[PDB]
Write an enzyme that holds these catalytic residues in place. Structure first.
Site, short mmCIF file in Angstrom:
data_model
loop_
_atom_site.label_atom_id
_atom_site.label_comp_id
_atom_site.label_asym_id
_atom_site.label_seq_id
_atom_site.Cartn_x
_atom_site.Cartn_y
_atom_site.Cartn_z
N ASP A 26 -22.33 32.77 32.14
CA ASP A 26 -23.31 33.10 33.18
C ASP A 26 -22.66 33.88 34.31
O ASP A 26 -22.03 33.29 35.20
CB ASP A 26 -23.91 31.80 33.72
N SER A 55 -28.89 50.12 41.40
CA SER A 55 -29.39 51.09 40.43
C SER A 55 -29.99 52.29 41.15
O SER A 55 -30.54 52.16 42.25
CB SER A 55 -30.43 50.41 39.53
#
Ligand code: IMI
Length: 330
Positions: free
Chosen positions: A35, A199
């Site tokens: 994770d 992004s």
């Protein structure tokens, strides 16, 4: 040193991925959920409340000659989905894919919440976010990666998750045969303890690319792609009959639909998530309403590039002094 381990979907929907991890001496192999959105290595154990264990493999520290109680240390964690666990702590030898760390903090669960009990395939979590998020008190502990880093050939790990197929986590090297084209690297902020990056935009299907900054986290421990409501609405508007259902808990769409792809930007590069990756199947057995793999992050407080996004790429987690993230198509 290096390590290389195969990671395998737990079910037919790629809800999560499990990777075998060797703990203790002799080795006890547990299948952990790696994770990158958390920083605790915790396991089901011989100390876990018996009624809360249902099929998991447990770590028994008393059977490990290298286990040592970390005296006074406790831990307690709550995840974004509302699940939780807590317990005490041992140090022991932990190996992943041939890479060995001695003196790793192995957090032994005394209690786990229902969703953990109900998932027999996940024996615990191995956190790969920054150690500043580690929950051990009163002495915070280091992640497996942070402990391994100095021994690694290069201070990196890579996630290569499969779509309906196994993939690979590598430590200490970049497998140049595992991706196509070039890897595009992008800046990371560690301010919130995550692999947080920005992004450069998105496209829906064959539509034009929208240049817009989307800050979010690269999170292998989250199934879906969670993005701003504007972006998510634009995606689902291209699917006839798709709608957001408060009763179901997000966007659903007719199972008869063909889903468009979704593209996200990494610098000037583009990663394309095929439409089929966005299909999470019937909301309940036999239903003709299917659950979407792109969902709104409104109310979470952070955008999350979960497995839906990451499995479309070869992803480099560069843990150099100034960390960065790399993405390549594959
Ligand atoms: N729905 C479930 N939630 C927990 C169990 C096994 S997977 C676990 C959630 C892990 C979340 C990790 C994270 O949010 O960083 N089932």
């Amino acid at each position: 040193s290096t390590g290389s381990a195969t990671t395998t979907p737990i079910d037919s929907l790629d809800d999560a991925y499990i990777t075998p991890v060797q703990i203790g001496t002799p080795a006890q192999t547990l299948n952990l959920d790696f994770d990158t959105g958390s920083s605790d290595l915790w396991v089901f154990s011989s100390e876990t409340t018996a009624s809360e264990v249902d099929g998991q493999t447990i770590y028994t520290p008393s059977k490990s000659t290298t286990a040592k109680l970390l005296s006074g240390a406790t831990w307690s964690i709550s995840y974004g989905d509302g699940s939780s666990s807590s317990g005490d702590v041992y140090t022991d030898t932990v190996s992943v894919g041939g890479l060995t760390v001695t003196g790793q903090a192995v957090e032994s669960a005394k209690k786990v919440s229902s969703s953990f009990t109900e998932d027999s395939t996940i024996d615990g979590l191995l956190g790969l976010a920054f150690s500043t998020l580690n929950t051990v008190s009163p002495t915070q502990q280091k992640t497996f990666f942070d402990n391994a880093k100095a021994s690694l050939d290069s201070p990196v790990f890579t996630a290569d998750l499969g779509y309906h197929a196994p993939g690979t986590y590598n430590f200490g090297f970049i497998d140049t045969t595992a991706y196509t084209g070039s890897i595009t690297y992008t800046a990371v902020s560690t301010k919130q303890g995550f692999w947080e990056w920005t992004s450069t935009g998105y496209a829906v299907g064959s539509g034009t690319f929208k240049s817009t900054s989307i800050d979010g986290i690269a999170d292998t421990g989250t199934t879906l792609l969670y993005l701003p409501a504007t972006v998510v609405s634009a995606y689902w508007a291209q699917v006839s009959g798709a709608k957001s259902s408060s009763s179901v808990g997000g966007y659903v769409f007719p199972c008869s639909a063909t889903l468009p792809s979704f593209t996200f930007g990494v610098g000037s590069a583009r990663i394309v998530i095929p439409g089929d990756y966005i299909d999470f199947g019937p909301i309940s057995t036999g239903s003709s309403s299917c659950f979407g793999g792109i969902q709104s992050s409104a109310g979470i407080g952070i955008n999350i590039f979960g497995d839906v996004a990451l499995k479309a790429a070869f992803v480099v987690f560069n843990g150099a002094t100034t960390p960065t993230l790399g993405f390549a198509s594959k």
